[PDB]
């Protein structure tokens, strides 16, 4: 049963959460091939495990930059959570370690690239295409929320496409285990729920708002609230007004009105029936939730992978030498990593 499945999932998660894996590899066990993505304090590189020849995506975080940007706790969150979870649509954390200068998280490689890249290129997804992806996010948030985890950075840039055309969620940088409410202003402007912006405390319901933004962006080709500057975006978000493209179906608009709901006592995912209000909505009437979970549904498209280390579905990035100092930096701050 569902209850039995989630109970076991929590048991598995709590053991690893209370006793996190630590120092399970070394940098010299990998050959660095190419940068797959970048951030303010690090990058993700395609690497090859020289022993097994397996390819991975290694996130490399500069410890000094993390400290400078006040992301210590968020980074500890990311690693502790990601090593503890297990779900078909979550990227797997295979190894983690640190050296004098950097933190390392060696993750499952997703050769299909980011959803963002495909969405921007083709313009928008059809509703069935968008629904297929949305269903996987609904199940992923059901899983995460049951563990008292809020994800807090949903967007196409953070959704990887695997070899089967299914999603793998990555970037747990803002993920947090919280039972009550929290207050950190973090996320991406286009995807912030009103309650985050109005600085009044918030909960897992911000993830369901973000799901609304994502479905809108997938189906429209642009997000529901955009402008040149974040301040203008925030004003639109809190307004309680959304405009829909004329090609949006009636069912899609009704769903989005209930996800992009400013009032928490009315937002889908946050009512008495929980995620079931979403799952049972007419827009998802054709969705076989069990088949989605079992990966038995044919994907809208599969990325052609002409090799285990093919990166043709990724943009090219400025490469930089991985510098490791002869002196240990920020030792105390990252002790538990």
């Amino acid at each position: 049963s569902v209850k039995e499945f989630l109970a076991k999932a929590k048991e598995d998660f709590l053991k690893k959460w209370e006793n996190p894996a630590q120092n399970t590899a070394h940098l010299d066990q990998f050959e660095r091939i190419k940068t797959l993505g970048t951030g303010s304090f690090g990058r993700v590189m395609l690497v090859k495990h020289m022993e097994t020849g397996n390819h991975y995506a290694m996130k490399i975080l500069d410890k000094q930059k993390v400290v400078k940007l006040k992301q210590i706790e968020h980074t500890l969150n990311e690693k502790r959570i990601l090593q503890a979870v297990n779900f078909p649509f979550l990227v797997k954390l295979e190894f983690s370690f640190k050296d004098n200068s950097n933190l390392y998280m060696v993750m499952e490689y997703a050769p299909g690239g980011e959803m963002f890249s495909h969405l921007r290129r083709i313009g928008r997804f059809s509703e069935p295409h968008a629904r297929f992806y949305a269903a996987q996010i609904v199940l992923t948030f059901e899983y995460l929320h049951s563990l008292d985890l809020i994800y807090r950075d949903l967007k196409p840039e953070n959704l990887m496409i695997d070899q089967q055309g299914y999603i793998k969620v990555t970037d747990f940088g803002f993920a947090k285990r919280v039972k009550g409410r929290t207050w950190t202003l973090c996320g991406t402007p286009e995807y912030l729920a009103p309650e985050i912006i109005l600085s009044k405390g918030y909960n897992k319901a911000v993830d369901w708002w973000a799901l609304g933004v994502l479905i809108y962006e997938m189906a429209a080709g642009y997000p529901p609230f955009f402008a040149d500057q974040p301040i203008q975006i925030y004003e639109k978000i809190v307004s309680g007004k959304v405009r829909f493209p004329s090609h949006f179906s009636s069912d899609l608009k009704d769903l989005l009105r209930n996800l992009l709901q400013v009032d928490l006592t009315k937002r889908f995912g946050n009512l008495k029936n929980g995620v079931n209000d979403i799952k049972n909505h007419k827009w998802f009437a054709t969705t076989d939730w069990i088949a989605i979970y079992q990966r038995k549904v044919e994907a809208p498209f599969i990325p052609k992978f002409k090799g285990p280390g093919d990166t043709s579905n990724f943009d090219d990035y400025e490469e930089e030498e991985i510098r490791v100092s002869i002196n240990e930096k920020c030792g105390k701050e990252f002790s538990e990593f």
Partner: peptide, 20 residues
Amino acid sequence: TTYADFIASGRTGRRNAIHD
């Protein structure tokens, strides 16, 4: 069009997170 306004905007590229 809204699509046209989006594409002419400065936020069609990868969006940075804020924190904060």
